[PDB]
Symmetry: C3
Subunit: 333 residues, 3 copies
C-alpha cells in the first residue's frame, strides 16, 4: 500500500517563514519526507547579552513548521550528531501512539532514526522533545516546534466557505527559566549538563525570566518585523509547548481564530484576544485594513513588554479615514 504511494521530499525553512506548500491538495495522499538535525548550541536571548545553552531542532527556536495534508504520511529522519552531548527524541502531538513517537525516536549523540506516522487529524499541533526524566528541561531549552495538518480542501469559515491566505507566518513563543545568583544576575555555564541542577531549581519557581518570540527579545522587530499589505489575508500560527499565552494584535483582530488549533471545529469570529493553552498550537486569520505598525503581543503586558513576548507587523498601503481618523490632533487645551 504505502510502497505504492508517491513520495515528495521537502526542505524546511527557518521560522517565522514557512516552506512551500499547497493549501488545497492537488494530489492524493502521499508520503511526505522531512529531515531534521538536532543542535545543542549557545544562544544569547536579550540585549544585555544573556547567554543560554539551547537544545534545538534544526538550529532554531522554535523548530521549523512542517506542513502536510490530512491523511498524508509524515516520514521524519531525525539525526543527533556526535557533537551533541545529550539524548533526544521527538513527540508529535499530531501522531497516534508511542508517546507521539517519543518512545520510538530515542537517539544518543551519533545516532539517527526514521519515524513514519499517519496525519489523521487536521489542525496545527505542537511537537517537542520528551526524554524520560528530563522532559521540561529539554522543552524549556527551546526544543519544540509545530506541524500543520491542513484539510485536503483547505481552510473554511464558520459557514463552510473557503478561506485562503496570501501569507503565513509561524510564531513560536518560548518561556525560559535562566538560573540567577543571590543579587539576581544570570548565571553562565560551559556545557548544558553543568546547568542541569540549577535549571531544575529555576523551573520549580514557575516564574520565567524571559518569554520570547522566535528565540530572543526583539527577534521579530526592526528589520525582522513581519510584513504585509492592506488587503492581504494573513494566517498566523502561534505555539506554546509549556505555558499558556494570550495573543493579541494591537490595532487589529483575529477575524477567524482556532484558539486550540483544530480545523474540524468552526473558528471563533472577531476575537480581540484568544487563549492558547500550554502544550497547544493555534491559528488566527486576519485581513489587514490599515497600514502602519502593529504590535503582536502576549496580552499579559508584563510578559510582553518586560519579559520579551512582543513582535512587530509592518503593513504598507493607504490609510482609511472612515475606519479611523484623528479629528483634533493632540494640542494645548
Amino acid at each position: 500500500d504505502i510502497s505504492t504511494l508517491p513520495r515528495v521530499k521537502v526542505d524546511l525553512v527557518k521560522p517565522p517563514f514557512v516552506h512551500a506548500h499547497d493549501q488545497v491538495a492537488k494530489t492524493g495522499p502521499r508520503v511526505v519526507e522531512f529531515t531534521m538535525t538536532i543542535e545543542e548550541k549557545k544562544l544569547v536571548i536579550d540585549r544585555e547579552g544573556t547567554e543560554i545553552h539551547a537544545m534545538t531542532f534544526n538550529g532554531s527556536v522554535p523548530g521549523p513548521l512542517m506542513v502536510v495534508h490530512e491523511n498524508d504520511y509524515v516520514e521524519l529522519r531525525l539525526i543527533n550528531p556526535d557533537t551533541n552531548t545529550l539524548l533526544h527524541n521527538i513527540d508529535f502531538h499530531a501522531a497516534t501512539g508511542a508517546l507521539g513517537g517519543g518512545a520510538l525516536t530515542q537517539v544518543n549523540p551519533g545516532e539517527e532514526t526514521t519515524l513514519r506516522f499517519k496525519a489523521t487529524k487536521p489542525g496545527v499541533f505542537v511537537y517537542h522533545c520528551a526524554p524520560e526524566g528530563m522532559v521540561p528541561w529539554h522543552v524549556t531549552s527551546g526544543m519544540n516546534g509545530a506541524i500543520m495538518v491542513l484539510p485536503r480542501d483547505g481552510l473554511k469559515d464558520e459557514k463552510g466557505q473557503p478561506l485562503t491566505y496570501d501569507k503565513i507566518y509561524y510564531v513560536g513563543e518560548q518561556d525560559f527559566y535562566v538560573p540567577k545568583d543571590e543579587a539576581g544576575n544570570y548565571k553562565k555555564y560551559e556545557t548544558p549538563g553543568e546547568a542541569y541542577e540549577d535549571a531544575v531549581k529555576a523551573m520549580r519557581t514557575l516564574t520565567p525570566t524571559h518569554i520570547v518570540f522566535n528565540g530572543a527579545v526583539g527577534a521579530l522587530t526592526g528589520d525582522h518585523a513581519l510584513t504585509a499589505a492592506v488587503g492581504e489575508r494573513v494566517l498566523v500560527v502561534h505555539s506554546q509547548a509549556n505555558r499558556d499565552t494570550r495573543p493579541h494584535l494591537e490595532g487589529g483582530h483575529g477575524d477567524y481564530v482556532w484558539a486550540t488549533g483544530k480545523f474540524r471545529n468552526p473558528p471563533d469570529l472577531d476575537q480581540e484576544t484568544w487563549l492558547i493553552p500550554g502544550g497547544t498550537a493555534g491559528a488566527a486569520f486576519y485581513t489587514f485594513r490599515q497600514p502602519g505598525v502593529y504590535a503582536y503581543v502576549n496580552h499579559n503586558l508584563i510578559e510582553a513588554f518586560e519579559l520579551g513576548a512582543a513582535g512587530h507587523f509592518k503593513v504598507t498601503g493607504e490609510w482609511n479615514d472612515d475606519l479611523m481618523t484623528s479629528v483634533v490632533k493632540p494640542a494645548s487645551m
Copy 2:
C-alpha cells in the same frame, strides 16, 4: 457622509453602573460622542489603608463602560489636565488601525485630542492606555476599561432568539503589584514617578499583591453589593486588561456566556465557570431564580478571598424549595 450623520452626546457613569442606552437600535448609524478626563490620583485599595498612585480614565478604576451599536462612529475627546504628571493615550481593542488609536492619542499634561473610529465588530472590548515604553506600568496602575458594541438588533441566544437584559453591571478586575520592603510591608510614594523603578521590579515577579473588583478590596460588598430580584435577567460584563481571570457566581451559573466577548459567536450555555483571557472583555447572562446573597468571584479562590477578587450580589424574592431545600437542618448526630 459623516457630516450628514446624526450625532448624540452621552455622559458616562461610574462603574459598576452603565450609562443609558437601547439594546435594539431605534435609529440608524450615528456619531456617538464621549468625553473622558485622565486623572492621576491616590487610591487606598485595602482595609489596612494601603495607598497607591492610580492612573485613571475619568477618575475611576476601571474606566467607565462605553456603549454603542455596530457601525456607529465613536468620537472621543480625551483630556489630560495640566495637573497630571505623565503622558497618556488610549488603545481601543474595538478599533482598527494605529494601535487601536494609541498612536493618534498621545497627550502630555495640558493637552487634549479627539479621535473617531468606526465600531465595525460587535462585542465587549477592552480599552487601555499604552504609552511607548511604559505600557504595563500604566495598565496595571488602573488605566483600562471596556466598550460594548451591541449588534444593531440586540443580543441573541445560540438559536438566533432575542436575549433581553433587565439590568447590566460592569465589573472591572484589576491586578496590582505594590512594591514591598524587606519585611513584606508595602512602600508609599509621594509622586507616581518616584514609584517607577520599584514598580518595574514588582511587576517582573508576575505575582500580584492585590487583585480587585472596582478598584478596591470589598468594593462590591456591603452597601455596594450588586442587586437584583428573582426573575430579573442580568448581563454582567467583566474585563481584565492584563491577566487571566475565571469568573464564577457562587449559587448560580452563566446561562449564556461569551467568554471572549464577541457576539457574532453563539454563547456557551450553562457555564459554571469561564475563562476570560488577559487583555479581553467577556459577558455573562443569567436569570436569577433564588433570593439571597451570591458571591461573584474569580475562581482561583486564593486570588478571590486572600487577594480581593470577590464581590456580592444581593437578590430579593421568594425562595424556591423545588430547586433547593434543607431537609434536615444541621443538628447533633
Copy 3:
C-alpha cells in the same frame, strides 16, 4: 410531588473509579440519595514522605464523583464526625441557590445535615467546601470533588449522534501549598489549626509546592495506572477547583471534549490539549487506537514532571503500523 417520586440510594466508590450508573436513563426522574462523611486526616503526598493534614469528603482527595441525570433530585446526607476539629460545608456548582448549598450545610464536629437540590443543568460540575473566612484553606487542603449530571438521553456528538463510553475515570487535580522553612524544607504540624497561619502565607505566593492527581505524586502510575484496551471508548472527567490546568494525553487526543464541561454545548473535536479553568470540571472522550503506555499530563510540563501532575494509561491490544511505525530503529550514523 417529591414524596411521590421513586428513591434510590447509591454507594460511592473511591476515585479514579466511578459508581455504577446508566448513561441513558431507563427510569423517569428520581430522588438520588448519597451519604458522605467528612474526614480530616494526615496524608503523605510525595516520595520524600512529605505529610499534610488533608480535609476530605469520604476520606479521599478528590472527593468521590457523584452521577445523576438531568432533573433528578440530589439528596445528600453530610456527616461531620466529632473526631474532626473544624466546621465544614458543601457548595455544589451544580445547584441553584444558597451558595450552591454552602449556606445550608454548615456542620460543626458532631453534626450532620441533609440537603436536597434539583439537578437542572447537564454537565460535570465541581463541588467544594466553602466555610466563611477560610474557603481557600479548605479547598486547597483537598476538600473538593465533582458531580456529573448526564442528559437523560446520554451524551451526543457535535451532530446530535449518540456517544457511549465503555469506561469512565475521574481524575481530580489538586494544587497544594505546603509551608516551608528558610532552607526550603517542608514544615510538619500536629493539628490542622497549628498550620493555619503558615498556610495562609504559603497560599499568597500563588505558587503551589505540589500539583497532584488523585492525592499524591505518582498516584496513577505503576500498579495504579489507568487501564483500557484498543477499541475501547473512554470518558475522562477532570476537575480543578482552584487553579487552571491543561490536560493532554501524550500519544493520543481528545476526540470529543467539553473543556468547560457543559453537555448542552457541542464538544470540541480532535483536541491535542484543552484548558479547564480553575473552579471547573471538564470531560474528554477518546477511543484508543494503539496499545502501550500513555502519559496523561497537565501540559505545563514543569507542573507535570517536577510538581506531580502526571499519570499513566496502560492499554492492551495490537499495534497498528499504518498509524505509526519505526522505519529505521535508532542506530549509529
